[PDB]
Amino acid sequence: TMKIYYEHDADLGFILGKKVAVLGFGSQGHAHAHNLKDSGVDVRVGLRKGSRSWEKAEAAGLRVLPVAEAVREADVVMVLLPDEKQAQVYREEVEPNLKEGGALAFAHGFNVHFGQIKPRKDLDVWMVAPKGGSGVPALVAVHQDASGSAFPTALAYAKAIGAARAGVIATTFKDETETDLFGEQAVLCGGLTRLIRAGFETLVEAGYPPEMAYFETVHEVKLIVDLIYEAGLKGMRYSISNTAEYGDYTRGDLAVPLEETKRRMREILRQIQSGEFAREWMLENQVGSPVLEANRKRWAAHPIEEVGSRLRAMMRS
Amino acid sequence: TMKIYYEHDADLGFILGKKVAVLGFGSQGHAHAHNLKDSGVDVRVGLRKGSRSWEKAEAAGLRVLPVAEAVREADVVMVLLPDEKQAQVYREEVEPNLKEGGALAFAHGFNVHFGQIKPRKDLDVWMVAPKGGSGVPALVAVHQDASGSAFPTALAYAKAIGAARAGVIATTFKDETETDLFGEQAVLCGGLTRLIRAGFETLVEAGYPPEMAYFETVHEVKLIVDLIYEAGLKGMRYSISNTAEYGDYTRGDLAVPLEETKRRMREILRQIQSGEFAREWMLENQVGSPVLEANRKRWAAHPIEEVGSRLRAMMRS
Amino acid sequence: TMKIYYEHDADLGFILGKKVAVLGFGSQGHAHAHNLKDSGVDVRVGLRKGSRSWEKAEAAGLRVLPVAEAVREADVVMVLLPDEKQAQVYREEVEPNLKEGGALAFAHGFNVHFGQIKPRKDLDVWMVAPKGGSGVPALVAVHQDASGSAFPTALAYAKAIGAARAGVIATTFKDETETDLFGEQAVLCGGLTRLIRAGFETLVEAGYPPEMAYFETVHEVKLIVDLIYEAGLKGMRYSISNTAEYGDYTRGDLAVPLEETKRRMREILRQIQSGEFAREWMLENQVGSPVLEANRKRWAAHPIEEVGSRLRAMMRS
């Protein structure tokens, strides 16, 4: 019971007559700028002079300018910088230089949802969040519609990128931002890495060889997750051995008890929704990311890395 | 500090002069029989008359016989049947028909490690456990060496299958069996599915749209696990956004607390090592697998399946 | 908001042209065979040769045959044996002998719901579960409809038995089986007997005469339950003294606290729904019912039995 929009719903007329400034040239900057030019919209990439990304962008054959300049001549500014760098670039280099009635666009809602960018009341503010006809759907959301055509423009932008093919889902900046932070913290990276680490340490402390601990706790994860990707949980259960399936159904809850886990995950979500997580992260970046650099180091020293590196080398032959 | 053996350590002379009976024709039977013939050892597949697998095996162009017959004329019997079916086929159709001084081989140690097969004292008993030169290493173990050449034969079998290329690791039936059950129960299927389900239910109960709950808790798992496969945990951390990395380092432990999780996983491992899990599973199969069929059904009804199916369909276009 | 079917909805044409084999001759076998003949369908009772039930069935004037024979000549087989004996009789004597496209019928869903009988794909599988025009309604359910007319046939069977008169309720094998086990365990036998025993022991240990403990804790139960049967709980409250009513409303919760009781009953229900109870009971019967025979004995020795027997004798005069 959700509103899906396709290529047929989106009209490239709302973008093709507009100048798009792509700020930043990571994986996202690369792909955004690439697929836009190959759909016949004039793109300029805004970068800092004499950067590694400056030369990489010219090598891909794109028009490259300083950030302030790229913005001065743009109708849509698509901001594809790290969350922690966006607010400063907006204040110093986008806010003063973006034409009135212009559009300010995002791939992530974080800085707008948590008020690190308080955009001018005259701008359109929208987001296209991607996740040939490879089946990559996208989210689209509009925070602010000054012109009356933010949503058609955003939908056109998704068409011009190739995201409309598999379907564009309409949402809000709130729901995009809060579900992204939740996934990262509770499941995708935070929870999963802790579960693997506890598995590996359990076997190694019980005196099983580290090499075999690594195979049964890290290397074999891909096999399971590929099945979930293709055919969901019930497909995954169907394909695994009955012994595996029986163990899963009767001992999974002992590993990860449902009500306790749901309680702890509700606290993770509370800190996201309350703004406490955003505050923590914003302040962390004000003082040189001490905790990030400290944790990186402790986790890079973990015995699981030595064994992992040896076995991945051994397999590459 | 582990003993690795390569193609150069293995001598195909120990297998090429032997008749191999492959029992069963799942994915493993298919691959074992295939790669053996393409390395010039004479293979026969033992199957039950008029089965779906009988016709599929003839269609791949293999010599197919009843199980008793395939065993009567074999020097090595490689048993590639479900754990719960192996013991009965061994008792009724392998034990009476396998030549004295023959070899009985496995891909999984479960039935031998837990005494569901008590093999004759005259047999060799060994295992090759796989996980062109695609980097698929294997485990090898020898439970029983009557001939004095079980280990060279097993190593030759791994060569004849293409498992020697990326390296063969010598282990024991105990360590193969107990680490496999542990992975399935604590991490790969049991733990991971419970963590995803708690994530998804947390978001849906908090009023986020199920479609977006599904993207941030299930679909995005593949992206993370592909990075872990390629470059381990520290590679995965390196590639994710700093916001994701910060969340992982500061909230992962809140989702999955280390000492509590390790305690519960030690209980999972205790039930494996004590034989309690094997007993539970063996008895389950004596009475028509009531719990397996009951749980399957409850998990197939879960709301996560409806939303999963809709979105996977939508993406296939 | 439930689907009720009456005599008018059921067409005896769907049964009267069919041969019915009734397997077993307890209370249910007796009544099923009886009421069918008195509605003009030809019945045969299948029994083991030279049993006590064999002679009792001939004495009621029914055609009696060995089980295999009764099945060979039947279109509908109605299985009215103890849950623990059904699976073996199905495997050895019904499966080989029941015509293709035949109907296999039950009064209880237990063996089908928990896969102790895995019925042939060509059979109809349905159930009639009864609980002159005495007001005995029935449940009806269809597990498997090969012919396209399982449900009309089942409904006809209920008509031919006299169960349609007070109404036939359509349900599923799942809901019949799981609610029956729940009632037996949590309330009807399990809970109620424990509550009586705790009452009786409380009074006797407090030094009240056992005879009077027995009257106020066991004999008087019938008076209350007859009122609940006739006029429900609010009828029962209406008829009891205001002192009794006041005590009930203000101390019932102290005896049986609501949230704690509901928690424990949810665990009883979980073990039913998960298949754990079915497994426990199936395995119990594989090894000669040690726990059943042990508990019987301990409960038959209970002081409540001596006093009960004396007072029931005294009242029969």
Add this chain to the structure above:
Amino acid sequence: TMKIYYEHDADLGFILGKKVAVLGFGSQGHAHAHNLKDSGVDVRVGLRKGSRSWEKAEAAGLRVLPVAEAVREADVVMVLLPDEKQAQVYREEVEPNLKEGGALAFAHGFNVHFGQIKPRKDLDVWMVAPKGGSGVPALVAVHQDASGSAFPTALAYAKAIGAARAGVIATTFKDETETDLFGEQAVLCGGLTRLIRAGFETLVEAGYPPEMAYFETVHEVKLIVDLIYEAGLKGMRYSISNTAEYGDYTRGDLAVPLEETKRRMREILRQIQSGEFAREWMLENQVGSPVLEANRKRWAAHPIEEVGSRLRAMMRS
């Protein structure tokens, strides 16, 4: 099992041909500048114009310059400023003015270990941490060795200061920084002051005169700690009365229980190692040190201060 270096291992040739800028003129600035000139290396002190420290440094007969100027003409910059002031002085006045291939030196690792100073890749970065031939050993550590001679230079610096005499211990910035913070928090200041305060309050609340509470809980501490300094714990036990010794051995654990204390100290250490403490302190200084000024005041008002001041005055006569 630790690497000790003496005067004989250190070659003053690595420092005597280099210009040293000492930034700051506390106790450490004073001593560093002093002992360097008296070992024949040319020193300049960098200070802010018209400060109290400016005039005090000229009065000791040292060449004094603005910070930017002192750095422009230096080969080694020794930073002896409060931890909270170092990062700003590095960014604004050292980073732009320090010659390429220069050396940046510290007495404390805090700002480098926690990334408040991210030093240029061309610099040497090392530390000498002191704790006639008075027995003052030193630590030495090298964070960054661009020239290939950071360690000999650092060792020479320790020689030129008089720290080599009692021995220089090679360590890391990590171990110097984390052990210093731990000592301050768990034992030296944090723990010890809390233990004294609880002792004093216990006696005063029990109605002993405050003067005598002060003698038995504060004044007598010096006697014990002087013995520990000279002859360690077993020397201290040896010199105290047997009654004191018996009380210590049988009631010390009641005051300060071992496993509980070790648990709490592991949490103190965790917050240090994780970067949480550094973040807390860095942010505190961004907003005018509210907690520091608040706590100072509450602790200065404590009744222990009034009694202390009276008795110290009384003893000075």
